[PDB]
């Protein structure tokens, strides 16, 4: 997609060479933002075949407030298998924080339920936020949240979302991250009888791994195509009741997938 | 400053009229990003007069881990007064979250010190973050954090910082929140023997209150002056160690002050 290709080029032209955690090396930029009007179709990359199924199960895994990669296993998403313990556990990652942030004093705060309620009774709120950055528990997580904090906003019957992403693998992670969030807006929008607005993406350390150069270049030379369109075949009784079968994508005609090694 | 003036123009040109909790009414946009290279000069607005002292004292207060207004009083900072109880307390607002975030297992994390250790020992880390967004204590706060989460980055021996501000009163608040963060950056870089990099501001609901329209067009009619210079006259043994007297601003010649009412 234009915005995506443009950020990829910007990493190449201006990125600084950094030595990372995995000792792989990256080209890196700090601070970037991109806007997606959901009115113009689903931001699913067309410059590489992307698979909506991986995207969809991860999201629903989150809404369930799950942190065990089993569910993801029985659906063939394996990205997280390298991070779980022998029990298949990841610690209190995304899902746990989203559905049950533990108060210092015993309780759990359901951030999705709060946000649904705000969206329904106080759309003007400037405090409609979800945070996965639980300082108190970062030590227990297999990996610290990448997609750390997001905020919803309503203006003229449209639901907008901004995500703050502290760390981003432009080639591999970015395309999933974008689609996942785009998808949540749509689900939230339907449960709240609102129309879709903008999906705003802001990143922290935005990088291309030193061994994605060849893949990048190739991608950079493909022509973005018209964005597909999302279809929700039924209005579940709640945000927690979606199923993989409920979603469909029209007009998806991408460029073949491109293979690249994950830096672990 | 060019950047702040362009943001105002933008809210005027693209903002939507929104109701708000204070009942005043606003013009708002959602999602904005701007960058200040700290090397160009200290980002104190020149198109209306600012007072560096009040910004200094509010920051020293945050850094102390203080949440009571007494200190602010002793130094003629009264903005926080409306929010404070009978005892002068605000609840576990910024300062408290910064220096002693309460964990569920009876620990308190000091995020300022953690970020200093990371800058000294692992400046390439993609997780040098400070968050004031404590979900479990929000209900104890006099006001939920506006400037909520910030991340540091080092590149070419330079310190950068990205702030995520969920809610922004562009006319009144912003000038204070830009100078505040820029002084933090200078303080951290001095402690860490780094040079200052960029201060990147990112906003959530970025607004102009209805009752600031005239002040806002008057300000806009002014030509920005050249940015002042910050001089630190000492190198304290720690970040918790600065005094108001350590700082000097040079070359500040602002246009006249403009008063506007705060929406409560
Ligand atoms: C360096 C690095 N590390 C990571 C660690 C954990 C992650 C977890 C989720 C995602 C982004 N979300 C998904 C969600 C689903 C899939 C993938 C990513 C990639 N992937 C492959 C399989 C994963 C693999 O390449 O082995 C696929 O089946 O489509 C997925 O199913 C990225 C990372 C990264 C990432 O992007 N980069
Ligand atoms: C609607 C709204 N509400 C707020 C509530 C609390 C705030 C706390 C701090 C700041 C921003 N940081 C500072 C830091 C110092 C001062 C002030 C703000 C404004 N202020 C006036 C004095 C106002 C007063 O002290 O009564 C000055 O310019 O000196 C200060 O001393 C803004 C708000 C807002 C804000 O900007 N807008
Ligand atoms: O959902 C995700 C998860 C991870 N990453 C990336 C960012 C970095 O490449 C890496 C995480 O490493 P640290 O930033 O924690 O070092 O994985 C993503 O892009 N998206
Ligand atoms: O440092 C600060 C503190 C507050 N505000 C503003 C943003 C909003 O106008 C208001 C807070 O209201 P809510 O967004 O919490 O409703 O104060 C700032 O700009 N800067």
**A105–B198 C-beta distance less than 8 A:** no
Dmax (CA) for chain B in angstroms is: 55
Q: Which residues of A touch B33 (CB under 8 A)?
A: 31-33, 202
Q: Which of A21, A32, A126 sits opposite B205 (nearest CB)?
A: A126
Residue ranges lining ligand 2, Cβ < 6 Å: B 51, 54-55, 58, 77-80, 169, 172-173, 176-177, 262-263
The length of chain B, given as a count of residues: 264
CA distance A257 to A158: 33
Method used experimentally: X-ray
Instruction: Name every residue whose Cβ is closer than 8 Å to that of residue A129 and which is 6 or more positions away in sequence.
Output: A115, A149, A150, A151, A152, B133, B166
CA distance A91 to B19: 40
Exposed, middle or buried: residue A55 (CB in 10 Å: 0-12, 13-18, 19+)? buried
Query: In this structure, which residue's CA is closest to atom 3 in ligand 3?
Result: A146
Per the annotation, does A50 bind a ligand? no
Token pair, residue A52, equals: 């909506």
If one counts the domains in chain B, the total is 1
CA distance A30 to B161: 9
Per the annotation, does A148 bind a ligand? no
Residue A1 DSSP SS3: coil
Question: Residue B173: which of B140, B141, B212 has the closest Cα?
Answer: B212
Does any CB of chain A come closer than 8 Å to the CB of residue B37?
A: no
Token pair, residue A98, equals: 């989203």
Does any CB of chain A come closer than 8 Å to the CB of residue B162?
A: yes
Per the annotation, does B246 bind a ligand? no
Task: Answer left, alpha or beta for residue B47, where phi above 0 means left and psi between -120 and 50 means alpha.
Answer: alpha
Q: Which of A21, A125, A135 sits opposite B131 (nearest CB)?
A: A135
CA distance A49 to A154: 32
Token pair, residue B51, equals: 């007072």
CA distance B102 to B97: 8
CA distance A153 to B220: 27
Going from the Cα of A57 to the center of ligand 4, the distance in angstroms, rounded, reads 37
Question: Residue A59: which of A257, A247, A251 has the closest Cα?
Answer: A247
Q: What residues of chain B, 66 to 125, have a C-beta less than 8 Å from chain A?
A: 101-105, 107, 109, 111, 124-125
Token pair, residue B100, equals: 């002693």
Question: In which residue are the tokens 């080639």 written?
Answer: A171
Token pair, residue A50, equals: 């992307």
Question: Residue A180: which of A207, A154, A146, A157 has the closest Cα?
Answer: A146
Residue A35's CATH number: 3.30.572.10
Residue ranges lining ligand 1, Cβ < 6 Å: A 51, 54, 58, 77-80, 169, 172-173, 176, 262-263
Q: Which value, in Å, is the radius of gyration of the alpha carbons in chain A?
A: 18
Instruction: Name every residue whose Cβ is closer than 8 Å to that of residue B21 and which is 6 or more positions away in sequence.
Output: A124, A125, A126
- What Cα–Cα distance (Å) separates residue A244 from each residue in A75, A88, A234, A247? 10, 22, 11, 6
Contact A44, A252 (CB under 8 A): yes
Contact B158, A211 (CB under 8 A): no
CA distance B194 to B196: 7
The length of chain A, given as a count of residues: 264
Residue ranges lining ligand 4, Cβ < 6 Å: A 126-127; B 21, 143-144, 146-147, 167-169, 173, 177
Instruction: Name every residue whose Cβ is closer than 8 Å to that of residue B132 and which is 6 or more positions away in sequence.
Output: B93, B94, B97, B98, B145, B147, B148, B149
The whole domain housing A207 covers 1-264
Contact A199, A153 (CB under 8 A): no
CA distance B77 to B54: 6
């Amino acid at each position: 997609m234009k915005q995506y290709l443009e950020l990829m080029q910007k990493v190449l032209d201006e990125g600084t060479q950094k030595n990372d955690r995995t000792g792989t090396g990256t080209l890196s930029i700090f601070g970037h933002q991109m806007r997606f009007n959901l009115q113009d179709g689903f931001p699913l990359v067309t410059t590489k075949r992307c698979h909506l199924r991986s995207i969809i199960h991860e999201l629903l895994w989150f809404l369930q407030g799950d942190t065990n990669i089993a569910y993801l296993h029985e659906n063939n998403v394996t990205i997280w298998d390298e991070w779980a313990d022998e029990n298949g556990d990841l610690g209190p990652v995304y899902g746990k924080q989203w559905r049950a942030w533990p108060t210092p004093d015993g309780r759990h705060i359901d951030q999705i339920t709060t946000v649904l309620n705000q969206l329904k009774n106080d759309p003007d709120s400037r405090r409609i936020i979800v945070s996965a950055w639980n300082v108190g528990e970062l030590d227990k997580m297999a990996l610290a949240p990448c997609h750390a904090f997001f905020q919803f906003y309503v203006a003229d019957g449209k639901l907008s979302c901004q995500l703050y992403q502290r760390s981003c693998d432009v080639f591999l992670g970015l395309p999933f991250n974008i689609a996942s969030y785009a998808l949540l807006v749509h689900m939230m929008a339907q449960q709240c009888d609102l129309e879709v607005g903008d999906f705003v993406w802001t990143g922290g350390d935005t990088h291309l791994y030193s061994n994605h150069m060849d893949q990048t270049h190739l991608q950079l030379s493909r022509e973005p195509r018209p964005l597909p369109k999302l279809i929700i075949k039924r209005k579940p009784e709640s945000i927690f009741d979606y199923r993989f079968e409920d979603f469909e994508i029209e007009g998806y005609d991408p460029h073949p997938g491109i293979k690249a090694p994950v830096a672990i």
